[PDB]
Amino acid sequence: SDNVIDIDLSEDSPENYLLEHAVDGRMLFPATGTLVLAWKTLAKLKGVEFEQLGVQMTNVQIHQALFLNPGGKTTVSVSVMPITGEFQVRDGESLISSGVITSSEGRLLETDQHMKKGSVLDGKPDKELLFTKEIYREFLLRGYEYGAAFQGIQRASLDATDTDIRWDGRWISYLDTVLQMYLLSKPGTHQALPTLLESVTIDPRVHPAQPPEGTTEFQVLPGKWDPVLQIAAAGGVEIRSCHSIRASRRLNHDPPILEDFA
Amino acid sequence: AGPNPPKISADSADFKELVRKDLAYNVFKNGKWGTYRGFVISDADRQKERPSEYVYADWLSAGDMSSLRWFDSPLKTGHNNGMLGSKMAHKLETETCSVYYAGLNLRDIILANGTIQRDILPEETFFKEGVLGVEFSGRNSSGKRVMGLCPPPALATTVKCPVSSLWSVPDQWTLEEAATVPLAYATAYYCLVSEGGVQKGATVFIHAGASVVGQASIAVALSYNCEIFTLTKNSDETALLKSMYPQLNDRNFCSSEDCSFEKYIRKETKGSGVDVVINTLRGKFLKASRRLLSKKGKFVDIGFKVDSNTQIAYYTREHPDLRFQLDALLESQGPEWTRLFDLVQAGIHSGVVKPLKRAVYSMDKIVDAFKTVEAEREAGKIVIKIRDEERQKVCPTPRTSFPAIHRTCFHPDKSHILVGGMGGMGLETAHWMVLRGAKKLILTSRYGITTGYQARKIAFFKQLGVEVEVLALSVNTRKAADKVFEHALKMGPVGGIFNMAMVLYNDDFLKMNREQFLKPLESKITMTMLLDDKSREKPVRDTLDHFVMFSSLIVSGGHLGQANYAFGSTVLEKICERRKRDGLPVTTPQWASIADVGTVALTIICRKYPQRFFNVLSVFDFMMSSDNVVTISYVLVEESMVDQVLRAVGKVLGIKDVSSVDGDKEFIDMGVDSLMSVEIKQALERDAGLVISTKDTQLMTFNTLRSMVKG
Amino acid sequence: PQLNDRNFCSSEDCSFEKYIRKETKGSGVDVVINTLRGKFLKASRRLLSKKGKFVDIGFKVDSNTQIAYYTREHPDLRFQLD
Numbered sequence A: 001s002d003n004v005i006d007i008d009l010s011e012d013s014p015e016n017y018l019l020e021h022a023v024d025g026r027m028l029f030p031a032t033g034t035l036v037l038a039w040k041t042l043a044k045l046k047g048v049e050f051e052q053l054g055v056q057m058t059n060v061q062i063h064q065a066l067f068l069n070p071g072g073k074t075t076v077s078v079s080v081m082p083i084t085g086e087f088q089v090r091d092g093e094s095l096i097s098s099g100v101i102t103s104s105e106g107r108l109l110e111t112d113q114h115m116k117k118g119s120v121l122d123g124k125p126d127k128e129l130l131f132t133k134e135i136y137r138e139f140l141l142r143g144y145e146y147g148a149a150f151q152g153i154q155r156a157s158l159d160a161t162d163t164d165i166r167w168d169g170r171w172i173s174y175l176d177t178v179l180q181m182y183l184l185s186k187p188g189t190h191q192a193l194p195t196l197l198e199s200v201t202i203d204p205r206v207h208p209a210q211p212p213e214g215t216t217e218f219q220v221l222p223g224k225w226d227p228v229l230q231i232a233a234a235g236g237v238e239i240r241s242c243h244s245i246r247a248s249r250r251l252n253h254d255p256p257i258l259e260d261f262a
Numbered sequence B: 001a002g003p004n005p006p007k008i009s010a011d012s013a014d015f016k017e018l019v020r021k022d023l024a025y026n027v028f029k030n031g032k033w034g035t036y037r038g039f040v041i042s043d044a045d046r047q048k049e050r051p052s053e054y055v056y057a058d059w060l061s062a063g064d065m066s067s068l069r070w071f072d073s074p075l076k077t078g079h080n081n082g083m084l085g086s087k088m089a090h091k092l093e094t095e096t097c098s099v100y101y102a103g104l105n106l107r108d109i110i111l112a113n114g115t116i117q118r119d120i121l122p123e124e125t126f127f128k129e130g131v132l133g134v135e136f137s138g139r140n141s142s143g144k145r146v147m148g149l150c151p152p153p154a155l156a157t158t159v160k161c162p163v164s165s166l167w168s169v170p171d172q173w174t175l176e177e178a179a180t181v182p183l184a185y186a187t188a189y190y191c192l193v194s195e196g197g198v199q200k201g202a203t204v205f206i207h208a209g210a211s212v213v214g215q216a217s218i219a220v221a222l223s224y225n226c227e228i229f230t231l232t233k234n235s236d237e238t239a240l241l242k243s244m245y246p247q248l249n250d251r252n253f254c255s256s257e258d259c260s261f262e263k264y265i266r267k268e269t270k271g272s273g274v275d276v277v278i279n280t281l282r283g284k285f286l287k288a289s290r291r292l293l294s295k296k297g298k299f300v301d302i303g304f305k306v307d308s309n310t311q312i313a314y315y316t317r318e319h320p321d322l323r324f325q326l327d328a329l330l331e332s333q334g335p336e337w338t339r340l341f342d343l344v345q346a347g348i349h350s351g352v353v354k355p356l357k358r359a360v361y362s363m364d365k366i367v368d369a370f371k372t373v374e375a376e377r378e379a380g381k382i383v384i385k386i387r388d389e390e391r392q393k394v395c396p397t398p399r400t401s402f403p404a405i406h407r408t409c410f411h412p413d414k415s416h417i418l419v420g421g422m423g424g425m426g427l428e429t430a431h432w433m434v435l436r437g438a439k440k441l442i443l444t445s446r447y448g449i450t451t452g453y454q455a456r457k458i459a460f461f462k463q464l465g466v467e468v469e470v471l472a473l474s475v476n477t478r479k480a481a482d483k484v485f486e487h488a489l490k491m492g493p494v495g496g497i498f499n500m501a502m503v504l505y506n507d508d509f510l511k512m513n514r515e516q517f518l519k520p521l522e523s524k525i526t527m528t529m530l531l532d533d534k535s536r537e538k539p540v541r542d543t544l545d546h547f548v549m550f551s552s553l554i555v556s557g558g559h560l561g562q563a564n565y566a567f568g569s570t571v572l573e574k575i576c577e578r579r580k581r582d583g584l585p586v587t588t589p590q591w592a593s594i595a596d597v598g599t600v601a602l603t604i605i606c607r608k609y610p611q612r613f614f615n616v617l618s619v620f621d622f623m624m625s626s627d628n629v630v631t632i633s634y635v636l637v638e639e640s641m642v643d644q645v646l647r648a649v650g651k652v653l654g655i656k657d658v659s660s661v662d663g664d665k666e667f668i669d670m671g672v673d674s675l676m677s678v679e680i681k682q683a684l685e686r687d688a689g690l691v692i693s694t695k696d697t698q699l700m701t702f703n704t705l706r707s708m709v710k711g
Numbered sequence C: 001p002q003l004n005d006r007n008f009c010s011s012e013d014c015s016f017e018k019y020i021r022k023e024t025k026g027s028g029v030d031v032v033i034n035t036l037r038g039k040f041l042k043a044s045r046r047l048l049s050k051k052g053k054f055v056d057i058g059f060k061v062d063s064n065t066q067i068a069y070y071t072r073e074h075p076d077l078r079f080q081l082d
């Protein structure tokens, strides 16, 4: 009924990076993807620019998975109720997301992480730091195939607490890199697909503006995972109490052949 | 070589014959000329069932109730898997029992058919081998006949039941009857006497009166002299309940087909309502049941298929989640549990607790038993008969074997050496061993912990309760080998030696000096002989249980520039066959390109695709439980609109040839969890105009799909 | 006199949840006598222990909460002494 979004997954579309996010060969729409769609829809309803709007989503259920069609086009029909804030992303007669989105003009951020300037991960040895190669070896072994646009975390501690998330302008990818601090906070071997983010605040007025066009040395925003409150915060974003559902692992190749050298 | 060994020397006789044949590979073994060849192991053998003393029921594919099989139980090692993390905080005293009958509840069916993931269960069961079965009835270690509840898996042949959860079977019930009592009546007392606080003369409303928990709830309430209202599906259930409990008239029965009971219960109680509501139905029946509550009434909701809003309530502490409380109590076994233990124990003596109806299913009919519970076409308990009860009342359990599928397990009291295990496949293999039982690892390297990824996982293991010792020692001298095993016997008996070391130097054979040649020959020859020698001498020889030597396909496929690595890798493959001649344990995986971990991790070499590590460990589990020495494992790389969508839909299910499989076999029969169905559902719209329901997906054949796209 | 400065928090902002959870070593509070509304009510419920009890005696309940009382979803304890 309200704003209909067309995700163009073509060769040179600006949203071609959305294909660099797959789970064992399944190219799914990011769980934080629906957060941006709902966030942008509220701004369009209000008439303000989505980057000047401070939102707060509550109880964001990812009801069902959206399989992006490579080299094609997918349509969603985001719908936000004017005063209550009930938002809903849907495709035809199938529900894909739900929750409540609210805007405000005051402080929406609980943790005081939007004030941190540099990075605690300075001067530490190489054996007390994780780098981009090693962080995404942990994710890959669990089935999360991240590409180059979703590989935001540049550094971290062995505790997974402190990070060096990268800010490069794209919002669907940045909100995912903040949700990766949650995934690497629960070491394991199974594959979990997030299905409920209880609270998300994206106050952009305390968040660095979009990089000047043509930039290549994108800056890094310090982030932190709060094991007490279960809050993943980095810059002007927080995700609190995100739950996931285990999923069986799919073999992308064909079954191996076992022989007996005799 | 036989009594007449060949005499191949220049102008010899046996040699001249070889030259005439002119064969590129001549090996004299077992007294005959031949060739080393890789013979394909059929795919049917990976699931071949062999006799095993201790077995337990699990699922091959999660969410499929037709994939339940019997696997080997680590209880052959005495202990049980999942002794990591929280499970190490409760030092419960346990009694090892031999299970004779295993009870089947709706909790097991819910987990088996994918309605709930194992992560909803108590955190102490996160690393358990399986999550199926809680109640049982068998014989303890002393021969006494016992029954009780234990953390899963109780659907096995041996359990380690806490001594505070074990009742004694009265000398009137057969072991078959005792298998129905524990959980049904333990939950009835929890719902009524522990959570509902029932009082004498109170009015209680019980949903699904014919269910096993429903029947138990009625018996407890009647003992409390309550006014009972129950929901019965059909007249057969109503008649059955009346026969079991003569105190029930036709006035105490309603219908679960519609929410018309509300007026009946609200008129017969004169508007006071019902004091306790044991709720299993959902939707509008849940709302109507709440509205019947008295002013002090309690609502106990034990349904499993909760909605989304009420699932949020559980997360945000709005409501208490009581559908997995018996499981949680059994982990802690604290004051709350002992109250239920006393209540049920009292009930047995006072005659309230009486065996329910039963339906015995053999072990091999586990799949049929699970389907019977799920359908709920008839009332009664479903119990799997594991053994046959002896005529005596106190006698030892005869030692017998059951057919089961392989499952590698490692002794928790034995130390395992992982030479070169701090890298690539070693760290993700040590993780596998920890999950499967290993709790004592000695990882060895030339330098030590030198990267942040290593330090993170070594810290992860130590957190889980594993004792990891990292030695920076290369075993290239008998002195070093003694030191490594000295640090091993000080942790525990040495029960495994894995060599996953590699030092590659790649160059054309002609351009390699002596030093450069023997670089990959230290971790594959010099080591493997020093580790082999130690395993051949006591005390390791008696204790040693696994001896694994990882190798590569260069032994059977060859490669260019890696003449040295080929030489060493083959000698490792022959040192692991001398061990077989002498009867010692030995295993030598012969891998191909592998993904996600190591050398390849940093694609297609010799046309062979890299394997996913979660498969490397699936076949590796097969490799350890096998009789052969070397098992080669590698992966090789691979119209009308009606056939277009069929291929895509078949590809989702994991079928390579859609035409090969039967056209009359439903999708659920092959296996369609919860994500394959949505992918098909969105694909039948993306590819064609069809729009189908998710539930319709699992009950539709390939022929139906073909006949539907044409329409 | 028994109470010390450690036993007090501030009602102005929802920073007590962090402090209480840290001071209780993650076990949570066994009983909550709740009068505040909105984000303070949710935060108080999240401090509840596994057995913890939530007693809500506030009078100015929200419309959704009031419907819960009518539906028998929750008990209404604000006029129970009466």
Ligand SMILES: NC(=O)C1=CN([C@@H]2O[C@H](COP(=O)(O)OP(=O)(O)OC[C@H]3O[C@@H](n4cnc5c(N)ncnc54)[C@H](OP(=O)(O)O)[C@@H]3O)[C@@H](O)[C@H]2O)C=CC1
Binding pocket: B419, B420, B421, B422, B423, B424, B425, B426, B444, B445, B446, B447, B448, B450, B473, B474, B475, B499, B500, B501, B502, B503, B522, B523, B550, B551, B552, B553, B591, B592, B593, B594, B595, B597, B598, B599, B600
């Ligand atoms: N990776 C693959 O795709 C394939 C693997 N394999 C086999 O599987 C294993 C792969 O392990 P991978 O981690 O991938 O190889 P890597 O090169 O990734 O790391 C191997 C480890 O070997 C250790 N190592 C080497 N020499 C010694 C030594 N003398 N003493 C102690 N430790 C030593 C190194 O530790 P440090 O660096 O600290 O000395 C290194 O961490 C090897 O055994 C290999 O033969 C078989 C076929 C292909």
Ligand SMILES: *P(=O)(O)OCC(C)(C)[C@@H](O)C(=O)NCCC(=O)NCCSC(C)=O
Binding pocket: A021, A022, A023, A028, A029, A030, A031, A062, A063, A064, A065, A066, A144, A192, A193, A194, A195, A245, A247, B114, B674, B675, B678
């Ligand atoms: P059935 O038990 O009904 O299955 C429910 C499923 C299909 C799992 C549904 O809840 C679902 O698909 N949820 C996942 C939503 C999702 O993909 N979120 C994360 C985006 S992908 C990522 C982490 O890579």
